[PDB]
Structure formats: structure tokens, C-alpha cells
């Protein structure tokens, strides 16, 4: 009874890679998708220089070794949250990828907000949504800038509500408030499509593992 | 509904469908007046 | 929040000149809240009625709770000197039984 | 009751503090996960500032040794009349073949850059590549 | 396993060198009226105008030839702290690539 619930929720945290997210991606896989391509040096943010491999004739290159480490942590965190049945919200204001990101969220079984973000959506949720609305437990920012080249309002508003954030952060972005920053290309269609698949495969694996974990532990109770 | 947090889940769910239809028609490739004396709903 | 207490730090009667009302008056209240166990916060509430400014500030401050580290539950861990804008504060760590010897607002 | 102060500490530290205070009675579901698998850096607010005086960034210009050869080829022959295909991961351009042959001759021990540049042109001519020495 | 440093050194984009007045092959992925959105393997796509000659030939999936100018169009302006970017590349459409 109590032991089984503890086993379901406490066992996953005793393994470094319980969901084996390492296999989903590789440095070579990321390099094929152009995830190492950054904005010109003029567009560089000061807090992104740790993640930049260098400047190839004006175009900043993103170290795909730091990206691999950071992506492993971010995908690992996103899996345990999905494993525990938390709400995950995908957020972006890039309109080229609005339909792809909404389609990804639907495939995962989670939520997407790719439209104009209303002021107070998270800090004033009860007014906008109802009395007992449950806020997201994790927000994944595939794009952290809005269409006026400013930080998306939900980056600060998710920190105000103490919600962890997994965000793709290109060379011109500000990763300081992103809980799990993933340095990488956010403009190329092939880079965005790769990240969407990774987050979708990861969430489905974590949801599937929970179903299997419950059946095994549940079956033991009669057996 | 997956579009709950937009605040207009039904308006944006409909704009999702029509934008996906538009994409398939554009990728896949007569008179358009199949209906006459009609108006768009107010 | 029965374990939290609210204290007023300033009540001001500011004025905004308006064409319709001429000089118009609002109540701006600065309050601080704390549970006496390390957690405290402050907020400003403005309204036309004083009672409303009290409610606005009191419930707003509960959303900005800092947690303050106390050495052995009775004092700060070390001396603290700082300048915030043009206000200077010089706090000193003191032994038990020394009591609060500070500005009346700092005592509150 | 919460800590909507996103300029002091981090979401995890503020949640740790609220629980110590006694205001947050139940751990969030993401808490234990963060405790076991934290990020590399703590997500704390920092105000971006401009560099002043003689402070400079630390970004290495990416220049390989092939670029010395490639610069000469573009100045002498321009870009190969064959178009670059950047979708083929193993594409070999006319310039990249020049630099591969130029390297091979240099391995033999030729020390003169002029010798390596005119000999490489002859080798590619035998291969049949159309190299036009376009000064224009 | 090849290292990232090796992958970058042997990358087609690293071989291209400067992207000014270079010739590249692109693919049309999006068309809006007479505007062609062409992916040439870089970070940002370019946007060209449908040529008057053989206009019907330029359909989605059609591979074309281009003359690159910039991989990203950006420029800092008076009083700016960062470069303004339009998130677009600059290229001149030359015509269809011969399938051969
Ligand atoms: Mg970008």
C-alpha cells in the first residue's frame, strides 16, 4: 500500500538516467540539425558567452558538447516531471513554428501556448481562468524571445510563481532565469523540429513508464 | 483541452484546424463560386 | 495566515490633480508582515479609502515574503553595511540580551 | 502566500525558504526532482551590464589552417563554377579538393607556397576540373 | 565517435568561407504569392521574387541556384546597444538547377 506508492515515486530518483534519455540524441545528431548555428556577433548576449564555441567569420558557433550536457539534464528533468503527471506547457511566439509546436504538444499529451500571452496569465490566473485553476508544473520555452526581440513575458512570470522552466536559448537570448537552459539554434526549422521530437519522445516514454510501473507494483499487491 | 492556457481554447482550436487544412492544400498542389448569395457568419 | 502579523510603516495622503475633481486624494499605505519566525515581507497599497489601502497592502505583502537568516534565532549572522539609494544602514551583530537598538521602523 | 521575488535567489531556493518558514506545507512535485538532478548553474537573476574601458569578450575566432589556402584559391580562381550543396553532409567542393591536394603535396615536403599552388593547379587540370584564373 | 571540433572543421559551411558572392543550391519550401522562401542549408532562409521567365517551374521542392550575400541581415543603428536583425538571409536567385 504505502510501500507501493513510495516505490513508484521514490525509485526513479535513485538512478542517474532512469528513462535513458541519453540515447535519444547525440552530438552528431545535433550537428546534422544545425543546432550549433548562432546569430551574428552583434546580436550576442553577454550571459551566453560561456556556451559559445567561437566566432566563425561573424557567426557565433554554439558548443555542442555543453549543449549535450545541458540537454541531457533538461530532458532528464522533463521526464521525471512527466512521470509524476505534472502539467507541461510549451511556449513560443515564433509564428513559423506555431503549428508545429501546437501539434507537438497534442502528440505528447501536454499543453501549448503559442498565441499572444495575456498579462497576468500566471500571476493573476484565478481571475483569468477560474477559482481553482491548476497552473503548469513546467514550462518549456522553445523560444524565449517575443516578436519584438524582448524576453517572453512568461519567463519572469514563471519565476514569480516558482515554476521551473526548460528553455532553448540562442546566442542572443538571456538564460539567467531559465532553470534548465539548452544552448542551441532556435531559428532553423531542422533544429526546432529536432527539439520538438526529443521533448515528445521523452514525455511519452515517461508517461509509458508510469503505466508499467503501476501495473507491476499494483499486480504485486494481490500477488 | 491542450489549448486551455491560451484563454480562447475554442477560437484557437478552430484556427489550428483551418491552418492545417491550408497547409495540406498548399503542399498537395477551378471556379470557387460553389455557393452564391451567401454571407460569412457575423 | 493567523501566524502572521501586519504592521504599518507609513500612511501618506498624496494628491493627483485632475480636471474633473481638481486636487484628488488617495491613501498610500506601506505595510510590513512577518510571522516572527524568519519570514517577512512588505508592500504598498494605494486607494481612495484608507480601509481599502490597508487591505490592498496587507494581502499584497504576503506575496513577497523574504526569508531572513538569523544566527541562533536571535541575531544576524554578521555585520551588514549597505547603501540603498541615498539611505545608509549599518547593522551590527550583537550578543543575547542586547535588545533592539535601532530605528523605530527597524524595530518593527 | 508566496515569494514573487524573481530578482533574489532562485525558484528552488525560494521554495526551500517558504517551506522552512512554514507557509508552504506540501513540497511541489518538481522539488525532489530538482534536488536529485539540479542544473549545472543555479538559476539566479543577474542584471546584464555593458563592458567599459578595456574589458573585452573571450570568443576565439575560428580559423583553421586550411583557410590560408582557401583564401588564396578564392582570390585567384573565385568560387568554383559548380554550386555548393550544403544539404549533402559529405559534399566535396572544387575548393575543398584543391586544399586536399595542396595538403598532399605539402606532406611530401615541398616548402614553397608558390610551388604548392601552381603544382596543385596542374594536378586538378589532369583530373579534368575546369579552373579559371579569373582576375576579374 | 567524431568530435564536435572535427565536425565543425569538415563542415560544408566551414568550407564555404565567406558567404559573400558565393554560389549555393537551395530548395523552395514555402511560397507566398510571388515570394519564394528558399532554404540553402544555413541558419536563416532567404526570400526572393518569382522570375518572370519559367515562373510556373518554381514550385515547392524545386532546387534552385543562388548567389549568397549575407547569411543573416543585421545592423546596429545609432544609439543601439545590440544589432537589429530581421531574421533573414540575403541571396540573389539565379535560376533552376539542372537536374541532369
Ligand atoms: Mg535565434
The verdict on a CB contact (< 8 Å) between E76 and A42 is: yes
Contacts of B27 in chain E (CB under 8 A): 60
Q: Chains A vs E: touching, with 3+ CB pairs under 8 Å?
A: yes
Handedness of CA D37, D39, D42, D44 (dihedral sign): negative
Helix (H) or strand (E) holding A217: helix A189-220
Total Cβ atoms within 10 A of residue D44: 15
C82 pairs with which residues across the strands?
C89
Resolution (A): 3.1
Helix (H) or strand (E) holding C108: none
Which residues, in sequence order, are CB contacts of A167 under 8 Å at separation 6+?
A140, A141, A142, A144, A155, A173, A175, A178, A180, A181, A182
The 3-class secondary structure across chain E, one letter per residue, is CCCHHHHHHCCHHHHHCCCCCEEEEEEEEEEECCEEEEECCCCCCEEEECCCCCHHHCCCCCEEEEEEEECCCEECCCCCCCCEECCCEEEEEEEECCCC
Estimate the share of chain D in helix, then strand, then coil, as percent rounded to the nearest 5: 45, 0, 55
d(CA A151, CA A153): 6
Nearest CA to A198 out of A210, A213, A182 is that of A182
d(CA A136, CA A78): 13
Q: Is E88 exposed, middle or buried (0-12, 13-18, 19+ CB in 10 A)?
A: middle
- A152 and A36 Cβ atoms separated by less than 8 Å: no
d(CA E61, CA A34): 20
Nearest CA to A156 out of A141, A172, A142, A171 is that of A141
| Chain A residues with at least one Cβ partner in E under 8 Å | 26-28, 31, 34, 36-40, 42-43, 53, 56-57, 59, 61, 63-65, 149, 172, 185, 187-189
d(CA C104, CA D4): 27
Nearest to D21 among C35, C63, C64 (CB): C35
Q: Would you state the torsion angle of the CA atoms of residues A91, A94, A98, A100, taken in this order, to the nearest 10 degrees?
A: -90
- E77 and E51 Cβ atoms separated by less than 8 Å: no
- A60 and A38 Cβ atoms separated by less than 8 Å: yes
d(CA E57, CA E36): 12
- B7 and A122 Cβ atoms separated by less than 8 Å: no
Helix (H) or strand (E) holding A45: none
Total Cβ atoms within 10 A of residue E79: 5
Contacts of D86 in chain E (CB under 8 A): 12-13, 16, 24-25, 40-42
Chain centroid offset of residue D32 CA: 36
- A25 and A182 Cβ atoms separated by less than 8 Å: no
Nearest CA to E47 out of E64, E63, E30 is that of E30
How far CA E42 is from CA of A169, B25, D13, D15, E13, in Å, comes to: 18, 27, 41, 43, 8
Under DSSP, the state recorded for A34 is T
Under DSSP, the state recorded for D61 is B
The verdict on a CB contact (< 8 Å) between E72 and A28 is: no
A169 pairs with which residues across the strands?
A183
D122 pairs with which residues across the strands?
none
d(CA C6, CA C60): 11
- D11 and D24 Cβ atoms separated by less than 8 Å: no
Which residues, in sequence order, are CB contacts of C32 under 8 Å at separation 6+?
C6, C7, C9, C40, C41, C42, C61, C108
Nearest CA to D8 out of A152, A48, A162, C80 is that of A162
Residue of A35, A97, A100, A188 to mutate, interface with E, max E Cβ within 10 Å: A188
Elucidated via: cryo-EM
What residue spans of A2-41 are helical by DSSP H? 2-10, 27-32
d(CA A193, CA A199): 10
Residue pointed to by grid coordinates 530578482 = D7
The verdict on a CB contact (< 8 Å) between E15 and D93 is: yes
Q: Which residue of D has its CA nearest to C69?
A: D17
Under DSSP, the state recorded for A173 is S
How far CA A213 is from CA of A60, A216, E11, in Å, comes to: 44, 5, 44
Under DSSP, the state recorded for D108 is H
In the three-class reduction of DSSP (H, G, I as helix; E, B as strand; rest coil), residue E65 is classed as strand
Q: Chains C vs E: touching, with 3+ CB pairs under 8 Å?
A: no
Separation of CA B20 and ligand 1 centre (Å) = 25
Contacts of A179 in chain D (CB under 8 A): 10-12, 34, 39, 43
In the three-class reduction of DSSP (H, G, I as helix; E, B as strand; rest coil), residue D67 is classed as helix
Which residues, in sequence order, are CB contacts of E7 under 8 Å at separation 6+?
A27, A28, A31, A64
Which residues, in sequence order, are CB contacts of A212 under 8 Å at separation 6+?
none
d(CA C9, CA C54): 11
d(CA D80, CA D127): 15
The grid cell for C95 is: 550578543
d(CA B25, CA E21): 36
In the three-class reduction of DSSP (H, G, I as helix; E, B as strand; rest coil), residue E32 is classed as strand
A181 pairs with which residues across the strands?
A167
Which residues, in sequence order, are CB contacts of C52 under 8 Å at separation 6+?
C27, C45
Handedness of CA C70, C74, C78, C80 (dihedral sign): positive
Separation of CA A123 and ligand 1 centre (Å) = 28
Which residues, in sequence order, are CB contacts of A172 under 8 Å at separation 6+?
A38, A39, A43, A44, A45, A48, A145, A149, E82, E85
Separation of CA A30 and ligand 1 centre (Å) = 16
Task: Residue count of chain A, please give it.
Answer: 223
Q: How far is A90 from chain E (nearest CA, A)?
A: 22
Amino acid at each position: 500500500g504505502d510501500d507501493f506508492q513510495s516505490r513508484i515515486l521514490d525509485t526513479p530518483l535513485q538512478h542517474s538516467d532512469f528513462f535513458n534519455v541519453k540515447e535519444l540524441f547525440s552530438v552528431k545528431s545535433l550537428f546534422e540539425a544545425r543546432v550549433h548555428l548562432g546569430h551574428k556577433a552583434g546580436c550576442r548576449h553577454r550571459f551566453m558567452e560561456p556556451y559559445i564555441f567561437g566566432n566563425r567569420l561573424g557567426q557565433d558557433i554554439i558548443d555542442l558538447d555543453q549543449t549535450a550536457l545541458n540537454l541531457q539534464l533538461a530532458l532528464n528533468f522533463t521526464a521525471h516531471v512527466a512521470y509524476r503527471k505534472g502539467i507541461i506547457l510549451f511556449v513560443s511566439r515564433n509564428r513559423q513554428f506555431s503549428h508545429l509546436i501546437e501539434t507537438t504538444a497534442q502528440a505528447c499529451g501536454e499543453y501549448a501556448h503559442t498565441r499572444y500571452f495575456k498579462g497576468g496569465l500566471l500571476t493573476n490566473a484565478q481571475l483569468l481562468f477560474g477559482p481553482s485553476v491548476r497552473l503548469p508544473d513546467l514550462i518549456i520555452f522553445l523560444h524565449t524571445l517575443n516578436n519584438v526581440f524582448e524576453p517572453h513575458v512568461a519567463v519572469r512570470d514563471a519565476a514569480k510563481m516558482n515554476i521551473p522552466t526548460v528553455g532553448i536559448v540562442d546566442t542572443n537570448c538571456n538564460p539567467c532565469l531559465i532553470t534548465y537552459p539548452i544552448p542551441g539554434n532556435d531559428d532553423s526549422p531542422q533544429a526546432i523540429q529536432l527539439f520538438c521530437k526529443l521533448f515528445r519522445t521523452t514525455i511519452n516514454r515517461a508517461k509509458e513508464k508510469r503505466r508499467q510501473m503501476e501495473a507491476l507494483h499494483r499486480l504485486q499487491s494481490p500477488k | 483541452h491542450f489549448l486551455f492556457y491560451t484563454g480562447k481554447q475554442s477560437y484557437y482550436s478552430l484556427m489550428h484546424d483551418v491552418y492545417g487544412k491550408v497547409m495540406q492544400l498548399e503542399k498537395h498542389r477551378a471556379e470557387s463560386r460553389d455557393l452564391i448569395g451567401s454571407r460569412w457568419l457575423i | 495566515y493567523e501566524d502572521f502579523d501586519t504592521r504599518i510603516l507609513e500612511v501618506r495622503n498624496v494628491f493627483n490633480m485632475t480636471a474633473k475633481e481638481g486636487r484628488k486624494k488617495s491613501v498610500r499605505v506601506l505595510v510590513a508582515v512577518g510571522n516572527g519566525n524568519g519570514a517577512a515581507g512588505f508592500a504598498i497599497g494605494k486607494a481612495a479609502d484608507r480601509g481599502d489601502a490597508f487591505r490592498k497592502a496587507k494581502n499584497r505583502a504576503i506575496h513577497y515574503l523574504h526569508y531572513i537568516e538569523r544566527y541562533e534565532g536571535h541575531t544576524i549572522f554578521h555585520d551588514i553595511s549597505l547603501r540603498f539609494k541615498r539611505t545608509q544602514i549599518r547593522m551590527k551583530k550583537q550578543p543575547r540580551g542586547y535588545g533592539l537598538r535601532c530605528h523605530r521602523a527597524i524595530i518593527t | 502566500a508566496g515569494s514573487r521575488l524573481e530578482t533574489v535567489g532562485s525558484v528552488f531556493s525560494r521554495t526551500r525558504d517558504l517551506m522552512r518558514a512554514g507557509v508552504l506545507k506540501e513540497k511541489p512535485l518538481w522539488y525532489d526532482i530538482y534536488k536529485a538532478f539540479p542544473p549545472l548553474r543555479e538559476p539566479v537573476f543577474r542584471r546584464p551590464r555593458l563592458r567599459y574601458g578595456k574589458a573585452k569578450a573571450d570568443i576565439q575566432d575560428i580559423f583553421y589552417q586550411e583557410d590560408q589556402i582557401r583564401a588564396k584559391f578564392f582570390a585567384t580562381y573565385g568560387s568554383g563554377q559548380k554550386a555548393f550543396d550544403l544539404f549533402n553532409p559529405n559534399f566535396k567542393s572544387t575548393c575543398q579538393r584543391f586544399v586536399e591536394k595542396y595538403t598532399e603535396l605539402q606532406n611530401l615536403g615541398e616548402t614553397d607556397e608558390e610551388k604548392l599552388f601552381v603544382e596543385t593547379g596542374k594536378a586538378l587540370l589532369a583530373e579534368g576540373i575546369i579552373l579559371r584564373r579569373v582576375r576579374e | 565517435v567524431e568530435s564536435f571540433a572535427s565536425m565543425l572543421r569538415h563542415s560544408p559551411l566551414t568550407q564555404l568561407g565567406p558567404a559573400k558572392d558565393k554560389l549555393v543550391i537551395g530548395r523552395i519550401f514555402h511560397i507566398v504569392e510571388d515570394d519564394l522562401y528558399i532554404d540553402f542549408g544555413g541558419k536563416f532562409h532567404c526570400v526572393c521574387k518569382r522570375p518572370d521567365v519559367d515562373g510556373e517551374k518554381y514550385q515547392r521542392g524545386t532546387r534552385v541556384r543562388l548567389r549568397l550575400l549575407d547569411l543573416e541581415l543585421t545592423s546596429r543603428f545609432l544609439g543601439g546597444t545590440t544589432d537589429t536583425t530581421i531574421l533573414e538571409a540575403d541571396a540573389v536567385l539565379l535560376g533552376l538547377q539542372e537536374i541532369r
